[PDB]
């Protein structure tokens with residue numbers, strides 16, 4: 001059977017998109033359960049300014065309290081060189097950088113232009129490659145931006161091509177506001193597939209509009225075999241409060257299996273993990 005991998009987002013992307021601070025011990029307990037689910041990669045935390053995202057200010061303690069299943073790679077998001085150092089100190093297995101395909105979102109989230117965010121990221125990616133660490137890149141607003149509206153496939157393919165050229169081994173195309181449909185997503189992938197193999201692409205679709213599972217099917221048909229999701233849908237959407245955020249990891253694997261795809265994940269463990277996160281999602 002054909003294999004499909006999922007990178008868990010609950011620990012970083014999920015908790016980041018929650019209007020509350022989860023106790024460090026709870027974050028650690030949450031990551032330890034995920035580690036027994038069968039994931040190959042888990043994004044444990046982020047070393048980004050505690051003032052811009054206090055939810056993960058305990059990124060250092062987390063990496064230290066977590067247990068290393070040794071067969072699992074624990075990655076962390078890195079905003080700059082200062083972050084890379086902390087990630088290297090925290091013994092991160094892999095690194096992850098982020099940029100936006102939308103100019104308006106970039107100078108509103110990273111506070112700089114797309115081209116400038118790429119330049120500054122040039123050295124951090126270089127430092128990582130030097131230390132033998134794997135680096136994945138995130139691209140936001142691959143379909144639509146809450147600021148500039150629709151984003152052309154070409155814009156997404158441009159920044160995606162520059163991330164790989166810098167060194168990234170994989171790029172996650174994220175539908176930031178979950179406004180993507182099978183059509184827009186398909187037109188985006190086509191552009192990206194023209195300058196990069198499906199093998200190095202990961203799909204990151206929010207279910208905010210209830211189309212995440214549909215956008216994933218299209219990606220599968222296009223060749224993508226990696227997708228990002230949150231075990232219990234952790235991390236909503238700021239532009240759509242209360243609304244569904246990340247695609248639920250459970251929903252994705254249950255569909256994938258029905259399609260004959262093997263994920264290598266334990267559904268039971270996964271459901272149990274989701275229930276856990278829900279104990280912090282609602283309150």
Ligand SMILES: [Ca+2]
Nearest residue numbers: 013204235246
């Ligand atoms: Ca997300």
